[PDB]
Each structure stands twice: as structure tokens, then as C-alpha cells.
């Protein structure tokens, strides 16, 4: 091969979290929402097969799979935790997926709600032609 290529795509992870003015009967003090998206509302579904949110073990059904945009989870709870997020690619070759450990932190009563954004850049060195055309459609 004479030529080679590196394709770069941008992801945006983030979450919002707001103190409820009255906790639920379970003691859930917060409503929060975590998401994975592209910037400028770009269509990352062109190359994203699914997004898996691994919630803390205390949750029921902690494996939350989003096969279509929006890639997000909305929940109520009482404490922050590390949230591993797996972004699976429409790619038979490697890399098959990528992983981010997302800090889902919550703020105290009386303070502003959490609004956090994490920008991540992915680089794919010499993808297959089929995966490359998907990456470039995004």
C-alpha cells in the first residue's frame, strides 16, 4: 500500500443532575441524565452501533443499552458513582468498541444543578473502506 489514512471523530459525553425538592419514597434525592452524543448534533449513528451505559450495581438492570440516538439514560438516585460507558462501532475489524469511565457526580442541596460536558476525540488509523465511509458520513 502506498497510501494510509487516519480518520478523526469527536464525541461528547456529559450529564445533568438536579436535586429534587422532595425525595421519592425510596430516598432518591436527585434526578439525573447522562448521554453520549456528537457535536453540532452530528449524526454519529453512521458509525455507532450502540452505546452501553454500565450503571452502579445498586441499580436494577444496571446494563443500559441504547441502540439508537439519543444515547442517554435518565434516572433518579441518591449518590454519585463511576459510570463505564462502552461505545460500540459499526466495524467488524478492531477496534470493536471504546470505553470511557464517566464520573457521574451529584451536587448538594441549595447549590446549582450539575451540568457537565466532556469532549473526547477518537482516531482510527487505517480503517477498512467500509468502516471508513461510515466514519466520514458523520
Amino acid at each position: 500500500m502506498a497510501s494510509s489514512c487516519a480518520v478523526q471523530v469527536k464525541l461528547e459525553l456529559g450529564h445533568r443532575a438536579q436535586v429534587r425538592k422532595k425525595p421519592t419514597v425510596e430516598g432518591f434525592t436527585h434526578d439525573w441524565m447522562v448521554f453520549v452524543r456528537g457535536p453540532e448534533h452530528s449524526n454519529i449513528q453512521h458509525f455507532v452501533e450502540k452505546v452501553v451505559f454500565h450503571l452502579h450495581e445498586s441499580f436494577p438492570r444496571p446494563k443500559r443499552v441504547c441502540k439508537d440516538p439519543p444515547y442517554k439514560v435518565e434516572e433518579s438516585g441518591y449518590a454519585g458513582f463511576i459510570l463505564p460507558i462502552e461505545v460500540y462501532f459499526k466495524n467488524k475489524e478492531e477496534p470493536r468498541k471504546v470505553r470511557f469511565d464517566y464520573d457521574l457526580f451529584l451536587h448538594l442541596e441549595g447549590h446549582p444543578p450539575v451540568n457537565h460536558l466532556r469532549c473526547e476525540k477518537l482516531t482510527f488509523n487505517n480503517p477498512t473502506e467500509d468502516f471508513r465511509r461510515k466514519l466520514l458520513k458523520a
Binding site: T29, H30, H56, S58, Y78, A79, G80, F81, F105, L106, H107, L108, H111
Partner: peptide, 8 residues
């Protein structure tokens, strides 16, 4: 700033 407890 200050944050809640964590699942721990």
C-alpha cells in the same frame, strides 16, 4: 464544589 456522597 461540594458534591454528594458516592455509592462506595
Amino acid at each position: 464544589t461540594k458534591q454528594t456522597a458516592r455509592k462506595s
